[PDB]
Amino acid sequence: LQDVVNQNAQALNTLVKQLSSNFGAISSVLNDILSRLDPPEAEVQIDRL
Amino acid sequence: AWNRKRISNCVADYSVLYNSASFSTFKCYGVSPTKLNDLCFTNVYADSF
Amino acid sequence: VIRGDEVRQIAPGQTGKIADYNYKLPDDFTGCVIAWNSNNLDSY
Known part of the structure; x- marks a missing residue:
């Protein structure tokens, strides 16, 4: 029984931690890239995330 | 120099x-030239030649 | 007619005085741009 809660907790933890990845975007926080790139270039970065 | x-x-x-x-x-x-009046930065270098 | 520099600014997603105050193209523009010197015809 402890193993199922451990596995679900690990799955959720890695799912959360995947938000710190950039996947090649100039930054991982969507807000700052929207708040410093004009849309014609910011769309390209957003698509990768 | x-x-x-x-x-x-x-x-x-x-x-x-x-x-x-x-x-x-x-x-x-x-970064976009039109928003620089909004962002805040740590320091700025001007290399002149 | 456009004279002087910034002639290349006539294009989508371009910035500059001409693109910002004179002639602005849409982001999804679908079409062709054509230019040629006309000093013989247009030369205050």
Whole structure:
């Protein structure tokens, strides 16, 4: 029984931690890239995330 | 022997440089020239040559 | 007619005095741009 809660907790933890990845975007926080790139270039970065 | 002046601890109005037609070329990589009046930065280097 | 520099600014997603105050193209523009010197015809 402890193993199922451990596995679900690990799955959720890695799912959360995947938000710190950039996947090649100039930054991982969507807000700052929207708040410093004009849309014609910011769309390209957003698509990768 | 290009010079390097460090710029910090001030309010920098980039709009004058953006709007001034005295510049033959003003090309910017990484950030949009039209929003620089909004962002805040740590320090700024001007390499002049 | 456009004279002087910034002639290349006539294009979508371009910035500058001409693109910002004179002639602005849409982001999804679908069409062609054509230019040629006309000093013989247009030369205050």
